[PDB]
Amino acid sequence: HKSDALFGKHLWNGGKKIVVTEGEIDMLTVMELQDCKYPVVSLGHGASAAKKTCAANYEYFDQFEQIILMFD
Amino acid sequence: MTYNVWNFGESNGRYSALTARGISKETCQKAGYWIAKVDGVMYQVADYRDQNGNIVSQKVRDKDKNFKTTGSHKSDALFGKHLWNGGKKIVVTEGEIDMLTVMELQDCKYPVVSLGHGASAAKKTCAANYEYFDQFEQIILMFDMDEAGRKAVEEAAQVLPAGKVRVAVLPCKDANECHLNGHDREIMEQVWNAGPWIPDGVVSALSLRERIREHLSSEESVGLLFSGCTGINDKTLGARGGEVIMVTSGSGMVMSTFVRQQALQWGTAMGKKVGLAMLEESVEETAEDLIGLHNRVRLRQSDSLKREIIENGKFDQWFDELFGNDTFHLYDSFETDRLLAKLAYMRSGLGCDVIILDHISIVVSASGESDERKMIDNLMTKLKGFAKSTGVVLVVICHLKNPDKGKAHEEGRPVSITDLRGSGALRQLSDTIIALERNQQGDMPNLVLVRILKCRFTGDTGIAGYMEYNKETGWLEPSSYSG
């Protein structure tokens, strides 16, 4: 479980907008409500490792136009 | 083991016309798009076969927009592939349905295959097939007309053979959206004779019509008029968005007022939201200086009046008056990259249209590096980038190095672009250069001159008018003056 883990990450390479949720279940949620058509990933160690997991992924996230942090 | 390939007949198969898509029955029949129905529900089955003819895999659909993939869908799957072994030209579409489309419009006489995992696996599916595709003279990539769809094309052509690739350009999302009442003839004009490219920054003029039109209406000739000296305006035609205005001069606080004044009238007379990064002074401080300036009184510079308006309610009144239109916002301090970022969110987040950055001379934080000569330039660019990239108006204040030649700055001495600080970046990257001179020991110690030192948009430059300091109100008033 590397310091840059994002659950759902492999689904999206680019886009106009990517929601990023705290945990896996919440990702599953946004992935519904949207009929799984847009991007959602969840924090790999979520909660506390928000800073590390994120900066580990600058490039990946910059692939999208706006990053919507939907945390607790 | 892996999901068995779906037997035709076993599953109640029919080669029926897709009435929903304008694909004929005869069409589905040739590419191998058949309609089964197993255990009750009716599925759409796409038959992927290798060049040898044998069915290697299936991609099955149900109504609601689900899937089910039979056989072994290898990393090189091309739907339609088995139909063409050679040719003068082969269209390559994103999905099965779009393949069925080109296969129509052409009476199924020429070659079309669709990507096996299409969308995202454009690079892999394609390079897997170098040999197969090289069997044709030119490869016409007819992918989706969106974000990821142009990307697909790019990654595709990269791995595809030599000077054969040409990009398809349709009026709508995909080749089928076109067919589904619209422009069959638009698809056609592409199959024959499409354009060339895997250029991520090269942009043929033709392909700019729309971007241009919308520009012409959006952005504005007489952009934001300098205040306090028609002249500045006459010669520069204002501060057009995405420009980078650079105010400079000698000891000029004159300079820091001038900018301040502008901030003022842009954020009040005009509707525009100003953003201020006054790196010299505090955020409280500059706010005061605005309020006082807006009320034509030297506010900070007076113990008595401060007290007076705090008590007589005039402060909360003036403050509301000036500020309460959420129009001014200030960067408040205590890096380069770090600054630039803040400035950006002013633009992007709070969406101000002017950012005034008072005093470039202050670089600040990332210390192990030589000449401010060099670095001044590095910043300069990021700024011009920020500017043009985002269309914000960026006024940038900047202070002058000091002659070594005879007459000083307060001796009026005029300034040239050579006279310029930096080591070229500003002397370059800036669109308009306004300088202000002030011979503070002379005939009019309060008279200040305004050179336009440069102005891309017009190139009309030179002396552009005079102003006079009212030591009393604090304003750079406009003045009568010439020869």
Side-chain angles (χ1 to χ4, degrees), chain A, chain B residues 2-158 160-483:
Chain A
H1 212 45
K2 274 233 152 180
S3 314
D4 83 312
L6 268 218
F7 166 70
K9 159 194 226 150
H10 70 99
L11 308 177
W12 346 94
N13 252 81
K16 250 214 179 98
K17 203 199 298 227
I18 188 207
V19 176
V20 158
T21 77
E22 176 144 337
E24 293 112 296
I25 289 263
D26 279 290
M27 186 275 236
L28 286 242
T29 300
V30 161
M31 277 236 33
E32 263 267 65
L33 309 189
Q34 295 195 279
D35 199 42
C36 309
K37 290 176 58 188
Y38 300 93
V40 235
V41 307
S42 118
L43 290 188
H45 318 250
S48 17
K51 198 125 101 280
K52 219 220 231 185
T53 256
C54 252
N57 272 322
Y58 195 81
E59 350 63 22
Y60 170 81
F61 283 136
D62 199 25
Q63 273 196 296
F64 310 89
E65 232 149 319
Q66 86 192 207
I67 299 161
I68 313 215
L69 298 220
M70 205 191 253
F71 295 4
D72 267 19
Chain B
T2 115
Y3 270 109
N4 286 354
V5 240
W6 269 28
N7 281 155
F8 191 126
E10 279 226 51
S11 37
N12 309 143
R14 314 158 341 160
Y15 279 133
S16 86
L18 319 158
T19 54
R21 307 285 223 151
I23 304 292
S24 46
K25 163 160 158 299
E26 210 216 57
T27 275
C28 293
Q29 228 256 224
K30 328 217 174 157
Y33 203 61
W34 63 285
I35 308 88
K37 27 225 114 208
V38 190
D39 284 84
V41 147
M42 151 194 340
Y43 303 60
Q44 232 151 312
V45 212
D47 268 352
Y48 286 77
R49 6 187 125 202
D50 54 11
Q51 304 199 262
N52 222 253
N54 348 271
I55 310 202
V56 210
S57 50
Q58 247 121 315
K59 255 208 17 184
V60 198
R61 95 72 121 132
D62 81 348
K63 51 244 178 283
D64 335 80
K65 259 182 259 279
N66 245 350
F67 286 78
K68 272 126 153 237
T69 159
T70 103
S72 290
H73 212 44
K74 273 235 151 179
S75 317
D76 83 312
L78 269 216
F79 166 72
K81 162 197 224 148
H82 69 99
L83 310 176
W84 346 97
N85 250 85
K88 251 215 179 93
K89 202 198 298 222
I90 191 209
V91 175
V92 158
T93 75
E94 174 144 340
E96 292 114 296
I97 290 265
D98 281 289
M99 186 273 237
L100 285 243
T101 301
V102 163
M103 276 232 39
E104 263 268 68
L105 309 189
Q106 295 196 279
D107 199 41
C108 308
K109 291 175 57 189
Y110 300 94
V112 234
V113 306
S114 117
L115 290 185
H117 319 251
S120 17
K123 196 124 100 282
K124 219 220 233 187
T125 256
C126 248
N129 273 322
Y130 193 81
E131 350 61 22
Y132 171 80
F133 283 138
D134 199 25
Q135 274 195 298
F136 311 92
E137 231 149 319
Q138 86 192 207
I139 300 158
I140 311 213
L141 294 222
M142 206 193 252
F143 294 4
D144 270 18
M145 285 322 236
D146 52 61
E147 242 166 349
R150 248 66 296 251
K151 228 248 171 68
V153 178
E154 273 300 278
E155 236 85 348
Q158 228 89 8
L160 271 143
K164 300 187 114 129
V165 241
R166 19 256 332 286
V167 142
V169 150
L170 299 140
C172 338
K173 193 217 197 71
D174 40 65
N176 182 271
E177 172 154 327
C178 296
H179 189 40
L180 280 220
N181 281 186
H183 342 285
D184 271 296
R185 161 248 277 72
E186 260 68 288
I187 305 172
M188 231 78 300
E189 292 181 5
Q190 306 288 321
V191 163
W192 335 316
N193 181 245
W197 61 69
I198 22 136
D200 198 314
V202 110
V203 187
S204 76
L206 254 343
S207 61
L208 291 109
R209 145 139 36 209
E210 282 311 323
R211 188 153 23 139
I212 294 176
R213 153 119 40 51
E214 118 72 62
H215 181 101
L216 277 155
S217 323
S218 254
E219 237 32 69
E220 140 245 69
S221 18
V222 221
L224 238 77
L225 301 92
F226 283 108
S227 242
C229 185
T230 50
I232 335 297
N233 280 144
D234 284 353
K235 274 220 194 283
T236 85
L237 235 294
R240 285 154 295 283
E243 300 208 305
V244 144
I245 315 286
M246 160 134 322
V247 195
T248 196
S249 91
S251 210
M253 121 264 153
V254 211
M255 195 207 308
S256 217
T257 300
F258 178 80
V259 173
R260 214 135 293 190
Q261 224 146 137
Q262 247 69 35
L264 227 215
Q265 117 110 8
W266 291 345
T268 54
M270 320 308 275
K272 312 270 154 310
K273 247 175 224 111
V274 179
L276 307 168
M278 241 39 64
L279 309 203
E280 267 302 27
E281 76 215 14
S282 82
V283 64
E284 14 277 18
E285 275 185 16
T286 110
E288 317 182 10
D289 274 310
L290 274 186
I291 282 171
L293 190 41
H294 184 235
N295 286 79
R296 325 299 158 118
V297 312
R298 316 265 286 111
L299 184 38
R300 3 221 312 284
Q301 294 91 356
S302 158
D303 177 11
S304 64
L305 205 229
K306 262 126 114 236
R307 139 261 239 145
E308 238 249 305
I309 84 182
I310 296 273
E311 298 186 298
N312 71 3
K314 288 205 118 242
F315 166 83
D316 284 284
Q317 184 185 157
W318 284 359
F319 177 107
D320 287 342
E321 251 296 341
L322 157 70
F323 283 132
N325 250 223
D326 208 39
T327 163
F328 297 93
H329 314 250
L330 320 102
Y331 167 124
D332 132 38
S333 199
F334 191 166
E335 203 175 47
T336 169
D337 282 325
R338 160 204 277 79
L339 179 80
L340 238 327
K342 307 304 225 147
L343 270 125
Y345 160 95
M346 310 207 359
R347 175 34 132 153
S348 272
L350 346 107
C352 12
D353 8 39
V354 178
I355 295 287
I356 294 183
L357 176 49
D358 192 309
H359 185 29
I360 202 268
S361 322
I362 306 94
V363 282
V364 138
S365 246
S367 327
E369 26 78 85
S370 311
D371 245 287
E372 272 238 29
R373 237 191 290 179
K374 171 272 109 201
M375 208 290 118
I376 180 245
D377 285 29
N378 185 313
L379 160 50
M380 222 0 199
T381 70
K382 314 223 184 114
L383 285 204
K384 190 36 207 298
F386 178 43
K388 235 91 173 311
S389 106
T390 87
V392 64
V393 179
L394 203 84
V395 210
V396 158
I397 274 271
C398 153
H399 288 191
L400 294 196
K401 15 110 118 211
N402 259 239
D404 261 74
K405 205 17 210 155
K407 87 154 148 304
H409 271 84
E410 28 294 319
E411 218 149 37
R413 171 220 252 251
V415 357
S416 45
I417 321 57
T418 131
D419 234 46
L420 229 247
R421 237 201 205 175
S423 265
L426 346 67
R427 348 227 265 216
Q428 215 157 268
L429 280 37
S430 320
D431 306 340
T432 308
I433 277 5
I434 305 158
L436 334 82
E437 336 211 313
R438 164 205 236 269
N439 163 227
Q440 346 156 209
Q441 39 118 32
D443 291 326
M444 308 85 108
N446 285 319
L447 183 60
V448 21
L449 182 130
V450 214
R451 256 151 235 298
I452 284 311
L453 250 53
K454 128 136 165 215
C455 184
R456 236 221 270 109
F457 190 69
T458 94
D460 182 37
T461 68
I463 285 318
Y466 297 54
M467 336 208 246
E468 157 134 18
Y469 194 53
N470 195 154
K471 299 208 193 163
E472 220 254 303
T473 76
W475 281 71
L476 244 14
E477 253 135 53
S479 195
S480 47
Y481 209 105
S482 254

